[PDB]
């Protein structure tokens, strides 16, 4: 509708951010035409970016240019968030959402790949990798939506109040800490996503979807290398009870805590963020 439009329009200014050329396309999948962002040398590995709740692909802005160097990365809008993904039938099981990623490697054209994402993308990526291991090389966890541990009874206020512009300030305000703002082009898009009434488009509880935390029999079974990463101010849960879950189940896991960072690890410390990333996904034999 109306604030369609005026979301449409500030993901636009939000991708002026974007610091190197890209191809943005559609592919085709049974929970509807699924946005692409692509970028990077196109006979390079492929790496699959997937944003959290509310931000769109546009967040990798400040870690586009290094990932994209020595990989050919595919940055992917959640269908069923605020984004530019068309849904279709509604994707609602964990069974969905892997088969929602099978579809956009396919039409890809891709058998295996690099992924790594960012809190509901994060949690994407467990799930993936845990139901579709033979198509993952290896795979990057960035302050993952639940997964490894329960939600602060919080988090669901701060969820249950996305119906307008009041609502997403709070979030924001939140989510970022006293310690980091958002660029004003992001910050300007999320308020405008949530301020647009799309229920096909609105991130909500599903009975055996998400939000969900893996069972210690789940997370014994990862046959994939992950990369685990944590800022030490997340509010949204105890990430030190996350990381020593993590650590103790997940076999060859590499989890750290990051200083000086909340949630939006990959936007507040984009440096050391970019470079961890490169070192762990250059670490296979
Ligand atoms: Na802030
Ligand atoms: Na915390």
């Not at 400040?62 to 050919?72: D, G, H, K, T």
């Not at 939600?151 to 709070?170: C, I, M, Q």
């Not at 101010?233 to 960072?261: C, D, T, W």
Request: with cysteine; charged share 20%; glycine share 8%.
């Amino acid at each position: 509708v109306e604030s369609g439009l005026r979301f449409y329009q500030a993901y636009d200014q939000s991708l002026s951010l974007w610091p190197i050329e890209s191809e943005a396309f559609y592919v085709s999948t049974r929970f509807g035409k699924t946005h692409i962002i692509a970028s990077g040398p196109k006979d390079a590995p492929s790496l699959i970016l997937l944003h959290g709740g509310l931000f769109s692909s546009a967040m990798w802005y400040p870690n586009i240019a290094a990932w994209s160097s020595q990989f050919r990365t595919y940055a992917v809008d959640i269908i069923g968030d605020k984004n530019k993904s068309i849904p279709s039938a509604a994707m609602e099981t964990r069974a969905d959402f892997a088969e929602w990623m099978k579809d956009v490697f396919d039409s890809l054209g891709l058998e295996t790949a690099h992924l790594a994402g960012l809190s509901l993308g994060g949690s994407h990526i467990v799930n993936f990798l845990l139901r579709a291991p033979e198509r993952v090389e290896r795979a990057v966890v960035i302050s993952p939506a639940e997964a490894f541990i329960s939600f602060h009874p919080d988090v669901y206020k701060y969820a249950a109040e996305l119906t307008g512009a009041r609502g997403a300030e709070s979030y924001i305000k939140w989510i970022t800490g006293d310690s980091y703002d958002l660029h004003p082009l992001l910050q300007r898009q999320i308020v405008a996503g949530v301020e647009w009434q799309d229920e096909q488009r609105s991130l909500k509880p599903t009975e055996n979807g998400f939000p969900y935390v893996f069972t210690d029999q789940e997370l014994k079974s990862i046959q994939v290398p992950v990369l685990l990463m944590f800022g030490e101010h997340e509010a949204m849960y105890h990430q030190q009870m996350a990381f020593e879950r993590a650590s103790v189940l997940v076999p060859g896991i590499q989890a750290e805590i990051v200083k000086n960072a909340g949630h939006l690890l990959s936007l507040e410390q984009p440096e050391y963020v970019n470079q961890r990333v490169l070192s762990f996904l250059c670490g296979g034999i």
